[PDB]
Amino acid sequence: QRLTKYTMADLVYALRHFDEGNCDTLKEILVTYNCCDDDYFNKKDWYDFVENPDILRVYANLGERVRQSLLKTVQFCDAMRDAGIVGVLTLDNQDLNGNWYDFGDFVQVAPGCGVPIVDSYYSLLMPILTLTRALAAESHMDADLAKPLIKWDLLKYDFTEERLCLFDRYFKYWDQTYHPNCINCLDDRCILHCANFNVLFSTVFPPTSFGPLVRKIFVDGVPFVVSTGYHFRELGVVHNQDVNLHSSRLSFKELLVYAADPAMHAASGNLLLDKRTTCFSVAALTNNVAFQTVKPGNFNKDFYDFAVSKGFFKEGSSVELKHFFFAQDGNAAISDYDYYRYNLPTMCDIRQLLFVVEVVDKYFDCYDGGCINANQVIVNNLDKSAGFPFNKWGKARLYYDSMSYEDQDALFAYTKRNVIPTITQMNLKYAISAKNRARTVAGVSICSTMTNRQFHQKLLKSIAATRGATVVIGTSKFYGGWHNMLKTVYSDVETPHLMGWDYPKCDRAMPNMLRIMASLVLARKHNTCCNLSHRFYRLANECAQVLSEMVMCGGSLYVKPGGTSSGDATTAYANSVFNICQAVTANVNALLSTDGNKIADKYVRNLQHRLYECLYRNRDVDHEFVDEFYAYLRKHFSMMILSDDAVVCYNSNYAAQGLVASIKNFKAVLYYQNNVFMSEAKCWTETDLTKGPHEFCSQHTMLVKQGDDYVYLPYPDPSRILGAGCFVDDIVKTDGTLMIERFVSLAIDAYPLTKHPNQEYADVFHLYLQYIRKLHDELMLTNDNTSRYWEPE
Amino acid sequence: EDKRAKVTSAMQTMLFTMLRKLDNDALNNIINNARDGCVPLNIIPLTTAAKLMVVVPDYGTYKNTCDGNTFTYASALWEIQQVVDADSKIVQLSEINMDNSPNLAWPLIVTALRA
Amino acid sequence: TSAMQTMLFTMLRKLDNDALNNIINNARDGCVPLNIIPLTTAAKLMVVVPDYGTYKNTCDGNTFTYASALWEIQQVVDADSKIVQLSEINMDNSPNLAWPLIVTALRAN
Amino acid sequence: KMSDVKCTSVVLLSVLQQLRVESSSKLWAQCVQLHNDILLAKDTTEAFEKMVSLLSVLLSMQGAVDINRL
Ligand SMILES: [Zn+2]
Ligand SMILES: [Zn+2]
Structure with missing residues (x-):
């Protein structure tokens, strides 16, 4: 009696199955409990997290209400245990004031012997505990928002007892072992389990207690400050083992470890207060702040004028000059860093994450892998920056040509027993775009990339050499490759439709939990060449090096909250592990969220039933169920995946019934998984497979006649090809050889445009060939050299 | 080698x-x-850092961060030694105010030592 | 270059x-x-005019023509930083003016 | 004339960079803003107004005066 209108189930559903048109449940709850007024919903895009970030301040007003429900649940659970009651706790039996009712599934067995079943109860709540800042009260002295903040000791770095205290106060009846320090976990499943709790618990500890942990050590009697461990928001405290004090001299390897270690740079730097950003920072390494600009593109007037004389760039034409190198201002680099403000602590539904990851693993169950030695590592890009401070001396060649293979293996072995918290450097990029936004690259250091290849390269090379699988990296579009990739995804789908989607702010909002999941999946090949402790330290290093590393910008060191790094060895692959995880999650939710009794097909009805019962029960992995669910997705939701870019050929007859994910499922999943709103305006749907995917690998697809048969060809946007022709990166002004090579490559990409019905698109190819013949005569390319590129050999 | x-x-x-x-x-x-x-x-x-660098994007932030000769940050009192603008020129404290705000190469960098 | x-x-x-x-x-x-x-509108433009021969072709009373727009002249200051009246910038007084002159004007809508 | 105005803007901001307009952050930022607004323009009316303002930076600077030879 005297219950609220809505239940915890409605709040969780409204937040996890979010849809801007049908958001009345959420809007009413937010107004009812004074999170915001009604006028709040008249703000353009009030529900987004990227625009109008204010929504986080609004959801946070539910945080006290959410912790009150968690606390009442624990009190309820104690009462039913003492009463001898056995039963299941659900969200629709608890109202929004946290009161429990309607205990129909509860039975009595014996006084003092009851037990709550809370696996779906807490797992369903978990994603909204970080969204609504449920533990914000715990930052206050009495766990009371009306009182002062805890005067935490700056030198405290462990917080093991504090995490256990939170665990046993809010999740007291979560009957699964929690290990605050993930170093103590038995397998990878136990790391995601524990890390998910650490994400929530770590938000009430001060920001200065996280990151590298340091000690004073001596060499030849001279003191140094070095890292001897690291405190991870997700993994807890990891200590180093190979810590040697009172050494006499340092080895080359020790110099690399210390030079890369911010303990030497930050502890010795200036204190920095940077008001241009909302991100946490540690130290300035200078006395003078550096600013960085980007110059305009180098205009190739001869190409442009040549094209104008052929009818290009005329008013009213369908092909415009849209792609340019835009100049940047002084405070660009920092405004780029500041987009890391969108990476929010995100807790996952662990019962679902631990299922989805098994399905994700099935998708990579055809690739080879394992650890290779230093003399088995292939590095072609040796002109790549070695990162800060290594880049003050040279490029990767300098370190690869200095260290013996035995030393490269020794550095690798070090990272299997310790953690090296490296520094990467961010820089502005001079590149062609249709937009004036800043673009950057990540100068990931040599002390990371040199050992990441030994751990991951065998797998990355196996993935890149495999054709016909779902994750397609390194597969050429040429010689029928585009066509073969499309036939591979189309497969035997019964009623095929094509879909794609967008990942709003991916390289910045991707949470550390999914970044850990992806590195754990890629590390699953290390079974016959890596023990458990070694697999943990390698995870700790990947996390210290690319999720929570120190990033130099300008003249100072900033801390990265999360996201991806464009300079790392695995990003192109880790992003595909992620894309599959989100797509699988959307399909798991698409099926579980529908009405199981409205399904005409008994098979699917039984699949939905068993799917629920393989997530919130039956914790042990049911490999037969996973194989079955996986096979279902392969048949009705066929994916072709590249780093943050996917095409899905799906059975629309099932998607129509909610048995297969659709774009609305991706929108909901992204909203709570990456804290971003995905506009439908950036997502395409195509019903006619005569035409290919609207866009994949930034290219359009059309079916054309070739060989008295038909093939699919990719094609570029003509405005990018002409823009690329017209503006250069200032390196072809001295050597016509380079000018010809870039024009020939553009001419090849433009080739398929001659098959296009729009003559103005076809003309771009012909323009390029006449220009190239002119360049070859001045220094030959013919239409046969470009035609052979799409003819299978 | x-x-x-x-x-x-x-x-x-x-x-x-x-x-x-x-x-x-x-x-x-x-x-x-x-x-x-x-x-x-x-x-x-x-x-341990005796010196603090403060980077300030505008006047309102400046006034609420480093107004006058001294300010408090990280539980310490800091004394300003110099202010240098984004063009690496010296700016006097008497030049940083609302009226002359439009004429300065913002952000300004304030250098201060522990009192 | x-x-x-x-x-x-x-x-x-x-x-x-x-x-x-x-x-x-x-x-x-x-x-x-x-x-x-x-x-x-009403934004301020400042230009330098090196002599009378140039001035007579850009300024007429208090209206300045420049960059295909009219500007409303507010003030004229000479090379010795003195105020020069518009009525004083003419062919007879020019030999005694500290040319170049600075002409300050606002965009005329 | 939009394509010619945009190409001209690239050449013009590039010479302002050669003349070290980057030295003064106040002026460089203004020059970059005029430049990028030309590149993002759809209406040539606006693209030319921005070109007039950006060109005036080059004409204002002295010593390095090439127009005298036209
Ligand atoms: Zn564990
Ligand atoms: Zn291994």
């Missing part, structure tokens, strides 16, 4: 230069006050 | 915009802007 030798020398030179700047009383105090000799790296600059 | 300036002026001549032609042509006689030419 010239590549290795040049790297070895450069690295040793860099690390030792930093050690000369790093070894001080404040550092010994933060380590000695640790329960086991271990402290977070992120609290060392707050304890 | 010299190549870039050659291309720039060639391209500007090809565009053949009246405002662009006016500002380049005035600059060629020593009459250049002091600031970025303003685009909005």
Whole structure:
């Protein structure tokens, strides 16, 4: 009696199955409990997290209400245990004031012997505990928002007892072992389990207690400050083992470890207060702040004028000059860093994450892998920056040509027993775009990339050499490759439709939990060449090096909250592990969220039933169920995946019934998984497979006649090809050889445009060939050299 | 072996230069006050850096961060030694106000020492 | 450098915009802007005029013509930083003025 | 003339960079903003107004005066 209108189930559903048109449940709850007024919903895009970030301040007003429900649940659970009651706790039996009712599934067995079943109860709540800042009260002295903040000791770095205290106060009846320090976990499943709790618990500890942990050590009697461990928001405290004090001299390897270690740079730097950003920072390494600009593109007037004389760039034409190198201002680099403000602590539904990851693993169950030695590592890009401070001396060649293979293996072995918290450097990029936004690259250091290849390269090379699988990296579009990739995804789908989607702010909002999941999946090949402790330290290093590393910008060191790094060895692959995880999650939710009794097909009805019962029960992995669910997705939701870019050929007859994910499922999943709103305006749907995917690998697809048969060809946007022709990166002004090579490559990409019905698109190819013949005569390319590129050999 | 030798020398030179700047009383105090000799790296600059750099994007931020000769940050009183603008020119404190705000190369960088 | 300036002026001549032609042509006689030419209403433009022969072709009473727009002259200050009245800038008084003069005007809507 | 105005803007901001307009952050930022607004323009009316303002930076600077030889 005297219950609220809505239940915890409605709040969780409204937040996890979010849809801007049908958001009345959420809007009413937010107004009812004074999170915001009604006028709040008249703000353009009030529900987004990227625009109008204010929504986080609004959801946070539910945080006290959410912790009150968690606390009442624990009190309820104690009462039913003492009463001898056995039963299941659900969200629709608890109202929004946290009161429990309607205990129909509860039975009595014996006084003092009851037990709550809370696996779906807490797992369903978990994603909204970080969204609504449920533990914000715990930052206050009495766990009371009306009182002062805890005067935490700056030198405290462990917080093991504090995490256990939170665990046993809010999740007291979560009957699964929690290990605050993930170093103590038995397998990878136990790391995601524990890390998910650490994400929530770590938000009430001060920001200065996280990151590298340091000690004073001596060499030849001279003191140094070095890292001897690291405190991870997700993994807890990891200590180093190979810590040697009172050494006499340092080895080359020790110099690399210390030079890369911010303990030497930050502890010795200036204190920095940077008001241009909302991100946490540690130290300035200078006395003078550096600013960085980007110059305009180098205009190739001869190409442009040549094209104008052929009818290009005329008013009213369908092909415009849209792609340019835009100049940047002084405070660009920092405004780029500041987009890391969108990476929010995100807790996952662990019962679902631990299922989805098994399905994700099935998708990579055809690739080879394992650890290779230093003399088995292939590095072609040796002109790549070695990162800060290594880049003050040279490029990767300098370190690869200095260290013996035995030393490269020794550095690798070090990272299997310790953690090296490296520094990467961010820089502005001079590149062609249709937009004036800043673009950057990540100068990931040599002390990371040199050992990441030994751990991951065998797998990355196996993935890149495999054709016909779902994750397609390194597969050429040429010689029928585009066509073969499309036939591979189309497969035997019964009623095929094509879909794609967008990942709003991916390289910045991707949470550390999914970044850990992806590195754990890629590390699953290390079974016959890596023990458990070694697999943990390698995870700790990947996390210290690319999720929570120190990033130099300008003249100072900033801390990265999360996201991806464009300079790392695995990003192109880790992003595909992620894309599959989100797509699988959307399909798991698409099926579980529908009405199981409205399904005409008994098979699917039984699949939905068993799917629920393989997530919130039956914790042990049911490999037969996973194989079955996986096979279902392969048949009705066929994916072709590249780093943050996917095409899905799906059975629309099932998607129509909610048995297969659709774009609305991706929108909901992204909203709570990456804290971003995905506009439908950036997502395409195509019903006619005569035409290919609207866009994949930034290219359009059309079916054309070739060989008295038909093939699919990719094609570029003509405005990018002409823009690329017209503006250069200032390196072809001295050597016509380079000018010809870039024009020939553009001419090849433009080739398929001659098959296009729009003559103005076809003309771009012909323009390029006449220009190239002119360049070859001045220094030959013919239409046969470009035609052979799409003819299978 | 010239590549290795040049790297070895450069690295040793860099690390030792930093050690000369790093070894001080404040550092010994933060380590000695640790329960086991271990402290977070992120609290060392707050304890051992004698100099603070403040980067301020506009006047309102300046007024609420570094108004006048001194200010408080990271539980310490700081004394401003100099203000340098984004063009690396010297700006006097008497020149930073609302009326002359449009004429300064913002952000300004304020250098201050522990009082 | 010299190549870039050659291309720039060639391209500007090809565009053949009246405002662009006016500002380049005035600059060629020593009459250049002091600031970025303003685009909005009542925004302030300052220019330098090196002699009377130039002045008589850009200024008429308190109206200044420049960059294909009219500007409302607020003040004229000479090379010795003195105020010169508009009635004093003429063919008879010119020999006694501290040329170049700075002409300050606002965009006339 | 939009394509010619945009190409001209690239050449013009590039010479301002050669002349070290980057030295003064106040002026460089203004020059970059005029430049990028030309590149993002759809209406040639606006693209030319921005070109007039950006060109005036080059004409204002002295010593390095090439127009005298036209
Ligand atoms: Zn565990
Ligand atoms: Zn291994």
